[PDB]
Design a protein around this nucleic acid. Sequence first.
DNA 1: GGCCCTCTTTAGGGCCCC
Length: 207
Amino acid sequence: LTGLCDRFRGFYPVVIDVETAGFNAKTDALLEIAAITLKMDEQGWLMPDTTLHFHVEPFVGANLQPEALAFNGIDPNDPDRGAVSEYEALHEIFKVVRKGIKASGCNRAIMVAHNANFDHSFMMAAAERASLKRNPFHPFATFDTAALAGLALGQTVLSKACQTAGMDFDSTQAHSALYDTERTAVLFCEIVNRWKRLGGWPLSAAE
DNA sequence: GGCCCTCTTTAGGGCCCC
Ligand SMILES: [Mg+2]
Ligand SMILES: [Mg+2]
């Protein structure tokens, strides 16, 4: 291929997972976020690059759903969380992403996530509140690993997709931002690498 | 949390992005 900028029409894939206090991106709090950039080796194989992870303070006036907190087991009132503002978390992620875009020769970043619209809507909403400028992510395009796993593995559930792909998946570590992002990143890389392995990529190898 | 299905309506379990 072999360069990352040539693989997805100049899009720089960044794996994202968020933990929230509900399903409403407009009103519910962002509590946690992890980001994993990708890279290709000289042979053209995809693999994780830089990993970021932040605990996030609920923005002022945010709604908190008890059922959501019960699911992710996150206590926003814990002073020992080490949480930062949405601004600080996303500002650092954007900085690393813009740096990755520049070095790779890509044009823009695209979010890779499982059921990606969820994570995308929450990140865009948080960027709006924090008044962040020059959002390096595509405003509506995403790489949904649920759809990709549907094609590649015939499974749409993250746990099952990883297992089907022959990956390790610990249910005791599941539903945590860093672990979910890492497993999603490996899943996405495996799907992409498998397609190359089967001769589906490059298009000349599609033959 | 709330919609969906059915071995349903005097119910609960699946869903599986929180
Ligand atoms: Mg998730
Ligand atoms: Mg998660």
